[PDB]
Amino acid sequence: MKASRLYTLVLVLQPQRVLLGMKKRGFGAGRWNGFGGKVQEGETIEDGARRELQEESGLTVDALHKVGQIVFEFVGEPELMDVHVFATDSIQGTPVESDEMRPSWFQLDQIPFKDMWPDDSYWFPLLLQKKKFHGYFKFQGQDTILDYTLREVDTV
Ligand SMILES: Nc1[nH]c(=O)nc2c1ncn2[C@H]1C[C@H](O)[C@@H](COP(=O)(O)OP(=O)(O)OP(=O)(O)O)O1
Ligand code: NA
Ligand code: NA
Secondary structure (H helix, E strand, O other), rough: OOOOEOOOOOOOEEEOOOEEEEEEEOOOOOOOEEEOEEEEOOOOOOHHHHHHHHHHHEEEEEOOOEEEEEEEEEEEOOEEEEEEEEEEEEEEOOOOOOOEEEEEEOOOOOOOHEEEEHHHHHHHHHHHOOOOOEEEEEEEOOEEEEEEEEEOOOOO
């Protein structure tokens, strides 16, 4: 079996729009993503998701709700990424551009799927329907899915 590392992903989803972050330079520049990163020792996953949202975007919320869990496997990497996915309840602050990331709102009829991780095309729609999910995606590099599962669940 494999070991897994914990990550978070937060979708700042409002009734008509979603806030995404564009990676500004390096490996995978121009890709839009939710906000998140690695869970740290001692914090709950939800608290880590809030912390990462703040560090990454400048936003605070005071509450998230869990919407899904997705495991990513990359060819050549033995460690799995176990990504815990949340959506915001309500938000405080304006988002801020950093050296790493530029935030932008997108209307929900303009979700930039071609410039997002390919898996997002599969699980976003569930997210938008306010449903919960478990997923797994195996990637060759950044663009090619070799195997995946996706299942709606009642409890994440
Ligand atoms: N296939 C994928 N689909 C997706 O929608 N988000 C993905 C993804 N693969 C990775 N992500 C997200 C998960 C998480 O929010 C982020 C990856 O976290 P990072 O490794 O950048 O974390 P950290 O910034 O904590 O790491 P350090 O570089 O160690 O500081 O990208
Ligand atoms: Na981090
Ligand atoms: Na990050």
